[PDB]
Amino acid sequence: EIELISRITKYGERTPGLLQLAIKQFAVAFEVVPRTLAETAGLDVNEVLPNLYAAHNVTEPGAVKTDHLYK
Amino acid sequence: AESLRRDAALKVNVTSAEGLQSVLETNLGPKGTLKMLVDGAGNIKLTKDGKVLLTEMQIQSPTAVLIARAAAAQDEITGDGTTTVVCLVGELLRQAHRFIQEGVHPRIITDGFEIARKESMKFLDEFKISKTNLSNDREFLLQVARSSLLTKVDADLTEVLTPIVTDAVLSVYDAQADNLDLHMVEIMQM
Amino acid sequence: EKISGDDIRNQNVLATMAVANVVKSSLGPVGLDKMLVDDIGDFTVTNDGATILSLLDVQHPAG
Amino acid sequence: LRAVANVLKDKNIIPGAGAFYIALSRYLRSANMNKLGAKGKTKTGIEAFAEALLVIPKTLVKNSGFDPLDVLAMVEDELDDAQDSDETRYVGVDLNIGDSCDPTIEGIWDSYRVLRNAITGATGIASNLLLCDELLRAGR
Amino acid sequence: AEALLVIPKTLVKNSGFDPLDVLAMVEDELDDAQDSDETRYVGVDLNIGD
Amino acid sequence: GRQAQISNITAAKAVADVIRTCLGPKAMLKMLLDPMGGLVLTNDGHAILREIDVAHPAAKSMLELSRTQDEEVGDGTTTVIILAGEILAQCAPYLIEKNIHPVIIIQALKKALTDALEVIKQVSKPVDVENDAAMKKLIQASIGTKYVIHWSEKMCELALDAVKTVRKDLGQTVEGEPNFEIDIKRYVRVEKIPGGDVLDSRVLKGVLLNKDVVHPKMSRHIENPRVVLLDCPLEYKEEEQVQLMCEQILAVRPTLVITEKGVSDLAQHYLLKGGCSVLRRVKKSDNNRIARVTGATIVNRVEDLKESDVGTNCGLFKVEMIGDEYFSFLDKACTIMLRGGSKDILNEIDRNLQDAMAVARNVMLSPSLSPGGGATEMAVSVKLAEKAKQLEGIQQWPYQAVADAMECIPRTLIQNAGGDPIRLLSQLRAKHAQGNFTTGIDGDKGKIVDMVSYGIWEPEVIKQQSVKTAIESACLLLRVDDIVSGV
């Protein structure tokens, strides 16, 4: 759910027209799944959310993805 | 998360103009009706002048305040057409209120009037007719003076006041550039 | 009026608790300030908690 | 006195009895349609201005009980024959008889200064009433 | 005549596009088609708005 | 509790709700209903806010912050409130539903303000401050839609002569460098002079006084009059004491005598044979400007008056009557003389010229221009989306909410334009990427067009102070989480 956010936002600016507003809100609706997992586990909302974005977003000088996308 | 679509609102401002328009609607023209207005003074007074009607009644509605100020500017400059302007403002809001539900923006409504006003000046110059300064127009001034007289009376008094009003201006004012002063004409009440 | 027993003891705790909960936001330099409005309608903005209790109007013996 | 005072000041005169309002409302309607030099959206509100100028001849016949639609069609029928000929003839509403009339023969005339400030004056007054979206109540 | 113009304004109202702009583009297009001496049918496009 | 934080956002929304349609040159007119039956039809945003009676205390804080910006600059008052008001709207679900700490939001706005100023410096374009023709279209923003639109050609020459006269570079790294070092208060202060013409109006450099000659027979032409300043006037502190005070001034044999207070008739005969004019009724506030345009040392006691005074650089003594009143022309300072055909015309030009020179200095202070009509507000929001991905922190969520508030200013002009706001904002955002932020919004037409043709530009200092005060106003409302009552 977190990894698909980067792919949905990439197609938002690529598709012209009024659909740009619905595509961006389409990826935001997937953020509720990781948020409920942190609330039911007692973890803070301000903790898990920024750690998931920094794990799946890195700067790699190359086309092939590296490290781990399974986080 | 509080944000709105900015609902049209407006309404009663135009509705209050329709109620005020009907007051001066039947009061305009020589065939109109004469209404009696007495507020607190115990003195019966009947007049069709649109400016006098608004000054003798206390209006709490803010809409009629701007209309009351428009009659004061036309009296000190033009001195006539006080009721006609009121009828044009109220009727114009009726046609503009229907376009609100269609989505017509009020700024374009205001901008569209300025375009029609500039185009009206071109037709106004060709439609008007110039009148000579010669003093032989007294016969023509008789029919012109009756325009304002027939409005405020039953038309029986106009025939009596026709030679008086016409000869009042020509006698005091010789024909030159000069100027005119209405204060020099005395008024006696009996 | 005279009130004794544990009923007046609980009211004194809740009264001091309501006053304490107001000044908990100004504790420490990272804390938050507050505005004190009088009957005139004026106010002030300061981060010092010492001048707050002097200008704060509270009717209570422990206050 | 103030109506005759404007006759000596200004040499221009306009006929009354709705002769100017009917001729102006009809001219402005066909002028923008031929030129089409303003805008497509703007001409929507311009039509409301032309229809708002026809209330004056309809008001004069409304107090007397005459049909405002009947006297409106009789004036438009006379203006169609005047457009074909190259002459100039003014048409106006006669309240006594109920048919049309010649304002030059009847002698109904209105001041130029009064009617010039009436169109411009009523434009700004009626515009400001539509510029207020929400009534502001304050001060107490 | 004005009662028949609500259908093209109703179709565009649900799409979100300004019904005033689509009305002006159709009326201005029919005027140029008569002077060009041809037959061209015009209709309201809901997706694009023109 | 949390109820006080909701009332702070609600109070900020209620204040900005009135000025929503008051932003831009297309702003409409508002009707304020007074309890006494009066109405205010003026469309001025900051003039109505002073008469608005408010309840919540945070609404009074927005009125005081808008008054400070109204004195510095004439426009942009409603811009700060609308920009700061929309920030709390986007951050409302983040503070409550998302349970985000308020200081994190405040700290995020501080870091976003630094990045916002960097984008404004990049989108700015260089402009020549010495060009008189370039300053015409700039100051015109405060000119058009006013009575001065006809004289605007002559009004541009009057404003530039006063700013360029009192400005001093003095560039160096030692004591610090003010850019052009302009002083509006003391030097640019304008005094209305009745009579005359606007076309022939010129900028005078010196001190002007409307007082006439106090003696019936006096020479109306003096070659080089020397200004002499004093505190205590000539009078009994009896005939020798007044003459003794004159001998201290006549020691240098001056050809002109200017007294702050009145002059008795006994002192007029003593100074008559000395060949010097007597001028009484001089204000105290103007005495500081006289010493700078003359050099006579202000001294209290007459016996302590120094001889270092000089009357050099005096243009003319001519007393010739102008406007049925006798004037005096003495032309590091200047005195703007506004001449017109009546006092009502000069009263409107006064406030208009002061606001025109305030915008004129705004271009002089920052030699750069920013695109107007919502182009600057939209161009910054585009850069906020790119830098949001590189933050990688908890501040990313409140940082992205700023871009939504940055797009409210261009959406405001669209609400007054009459078109579809969603359709225009979608296409306008894509034009700034490949268009070098040259795509603005046209007010008269309403179709999205470039600003290269019309050439609408505004100085940078207005855009900098607008976004700087908005963050300080939005964060200040979040600083107070609790409100109490009582003395």
The chains found to touch E (3+ Cβ pairs under 8 angstroms) are: B, D, F
Catalytic residues of F: 44, 77-78, 355
Place of tokens 């004061």: B72
3-state secondary structure of C59: coil
Contact F18, D136 (CB under 8 A): yes
Up-side HSE of residue F136: CA atoms within 13 Å toward CB?
Answer: 10
Quote the CA–CA distance of D131 and D133 in Å, as a whole number.
6
In this structure, are strands F277-279 and F256-258 parallel, antiparallel, or unpaired?
parallel
**D140 with F41: Cβ contact below 8 A:** no
Quote the CA–CA distance of B51 and B68 in Å, as a whole number.
7
For residue B108, the chain F residues in CB contact (below 8 A) are: 418
Quote the CA–CA distance of F249 and F229 in Å, as a whole number.
10
Quote the CA–CA distance of D100 and D85 in Å, as a whole number.
19
**C25 with F485: Cβ contact below 8 A:** no
CB pairs under 8 A between B and D: 215
F77-90 and F3-19 helices, crossing angle to 10°: 140
**What φ, ψ does residue C22 adopt, rounded to 5°?**
-80, -40
Nearest chain F residue (CA) to B60: F37
Question: How many other CB atoms are there within 10 angstroms of residue A13's CB atom?
Answer: 14
Quote the CA–CA distance of F185 and F182 in Å, as a whole number.
9
How close are the terminal C-alpha atoms of chain B, in Å?
A: 73
Quote the CA–CA distance of F402 and F358 in Å, as a whole number.
30
Q: Which helix (H) or strand (E) holds F484?
A: strand F483-485
Contacts 24+ apart (CB under 8 A), F43-47: F45/F19, F45/F77, F45/F78, F46/F70, F46/F77, F46/F78
CB pairs under 8 A between D and F: 40
Contact F199, F269 (CB under 8 A): no
For residue E17, the chain F residues in CB contact (below 8 A) are: 420, 423
- Residues 6 or more apart whose Cβ sits within 8 Å of residue F261: F232, F233, F280, F281, F282
Q: Judging by beta carbons within 10 Å of its beta carbon (0-12, 13-18, 19+), is residue B176 exposed, middle or buried?
A: exposed
Tokens representing D11? 């040499």
Domain F128-205+332-367 is in which class?
alpha beta
Quote the CA–CA distance of F106 and F487 in Å, as a whole number.
30
In this structure, are strands F335-338 and F203-204 parallel, antiparallel, or unpaired?
antiparallel
Per-residue exposure over F17-38, b if at least 16 CB sit within 10 Å of its own CB, e if not: ebbbbbbbebbbbbbbbeeeee
**F480 with C57: Cβ contact below 8 A:** no
Q: Which of residues 23-62 of C touch F (CB under 8 A)?
A: 25, 30, 32-39, 41, 43, 45, 55-58
Determine contact: E45 vs chain B, CB below 8 A.
Answer: no
The chains found to touch B (3+ Cβ pairs under 8 angstroms) are: D, E, F
CATH architecture of the domain with range F1-127+368-487: Orthogonal Bundle (1.10)
3-state secondary structure of D67: coil
Place of tokens 């009326």: E27
Per-residue exposure over F129-154, b if at least 16 CB sit within 10 Å of its own CB, e if not: beeeeebbebbbbbbeebebeebeee
User: What's the sign of the alpha-carbon dihedral F407, F410, F415, F420?
Assistant: negative
Determine contact: D56 vs chain B, CB below 8 A.
Answer: yes
Quote the CA–CA distance of B37 and B58 in Å, as a whole number.
12
The DSSP bridge partners found for residue F483 are C35
In this structure, are strands F368-371 and F457-459 parallel, antiparallel, or unpaired?
antiparallel
Place of tokens 């005020």: B20
**F394 with A20: Cβ contact below 8 A:** no
For residue F422, the chain E residues in CB contact (below 8 A) are: 16
CA distance B103 to chain E (A): 8
Q: Judging by beta carbons within 10 Å of its beta carbon (0-12, 13-18, 19+), is residue B129 exposed, middle or buried?
A: middle
Residues in chain E: 50
Tokens representing E49? 């708005």
Quote the CA–CA distance of C17 and F385 in Å, as a whole number.
45
Place of tokens 């200040």: F476
Domains F1-127+368-487 and F128-205+332-367 share a fold: no
Question: How many other CB atoms are there within 10 angstroms of residue F337's CB atom?
Answer: 19
Contact F426, A20 (CB under 8 A): yes
Positions of E strands within F163-238: 190-192, 203-204, 208-209
- Residues 6 or more apart whose Cβ sits within 8 Å of residue B8: B100, B101
CA distance E47 to chain B (A): 20
Quote the CA–CA distance of F128 and F137 in Å, as a whole number.
13
